[PDB]
């Protein structure tokens, strides 16, 4: 219906709107994660900083998707944003496990959208995702995996010590 729209299916348009919702939900989750680690009874500033930076990145990803939706002549449609899955996030290990589950869900949504684009013979969409999302997700997931491994080696028989040291010597 737009004057500019060309080779942009309704199915891809809708799936992009849904992916915007998922990225904004993920940003909201990271916001909650960050402020949890800033509580005086949690107090891990490098962990807070790690998650607040991811909140920014996910919002930015949403904004990139929205810009692309308008460049293609689709129409942004916003839905309610559900609250994060928890109010309290446990230990740094617990939080990093929730983070990697969240990133793998975003990655799967990206892969699903790429498959849809491929089925709809939409190369601009496929290039867009390849260029700005797929590698960024793989790199982040790798980094979170590396963090989980280091967190876990640090538990030992002194879990508090290990949590402090990881925050001080990796994250800060």
Could you tell me which residues are annotated as the binding site for Fe cation?
A: 53, 56-57, 60, 63
3-state secondary structure of 4: coil
Of 36, 128, 48, give the one whose Cα is nearest residue 84.
36
The verdict on 10 binding Cl ion (CB under 5 A) reads yes
Binding site residue list: 53, 56-57, 60, 63
CB of 78 to Cl ion, least distance (A): 10
Q: Which does 9 bind (CB under 5 to 8 A by kind): Cl ion, its own copies, Pt ion, none?
A: Cl ion
Where in 71-100 is the site for Cl ion (CB under 5 A)? Answer: 82
The verdict on 49 binding Pt ion (CB under 5 A) reads yes
CB of 13 to Cl ion, least distance (A): 8
The verdict on 9 binding Cl ion (CB under 5 A) reads yes
The verdict on 126 binding Pt ion (CB under 5 A) reads yes
Say if residues 86 and 29 touch (Cβ distance below 8 Å): no
Torsion of CA 129, 133, 135, 138, to 10 degrees: -120
Where in 143-172 is the site for Pt ion (CB under 5 A)? Answer: none
Say if residues 151 and 166 touch (Cβ distance below 8 Å): yes
H or E segment at 65?
A: helix 45-72
CB of 14 to its own copies, least distance (A): 14
Cα→Cα distances 80→24, 34, 36, 69, 83, Å: 10, 22, 23, 19, 9
Say if residues 95 and 74 touch (Cβ distance below 8 Å): no
Q: Which does 71 bind (CB under 5 to 8 A by kind): Pt ion, Cl ion, its own copies, none?
A: its own copies
Q: Which stretch binds Pt ion (CB under 5 A): 65-73, 96-104, 113-121, 154-162?
A: 113-121
Q: Which residues bind Pt ion (CB under 5 A)?
A: 49, 118, 126, 131-132
């Amino acid at each position: 219906s737009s004057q500019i729209r060309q080779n942009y299916s309704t199915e891809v348009e809708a799936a992009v709107n849904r992916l915007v919702n998922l990225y904004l939900r993920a940003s909201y989750t990271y916001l909650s994660l960050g402020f949890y680690f800033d509580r005086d009874d949690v107090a891990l500033e490098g962990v807070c900083h790690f998650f607040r930076e991811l909140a920014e990145e996910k919002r930015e990803g949403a904004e990139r998707l929205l810009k692309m939706q308008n460049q293609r002549g689709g129409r942004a449609l916003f839905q309610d944003l559900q609250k994060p899955s928890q109010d309290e996030w446990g230990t740094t290990l617990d939080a990093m496990k929730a983070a990697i589950v969240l990133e793998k869900s975003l990655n799967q949504a990206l892969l699903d959208l790429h498959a849809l684009g491929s089925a709809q013979a939409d190369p601009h969409l496929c290039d867009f995702l390849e260029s700005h999302f797929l590698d960024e997700e793989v790199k982040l997931i790798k980094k979170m995996g590396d963090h989980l491994t280091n967190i876990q080696r640090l538990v030992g028989s002194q879990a508090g010590l290990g949590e402090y040291l990881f925050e001080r010597l990796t994250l800060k």
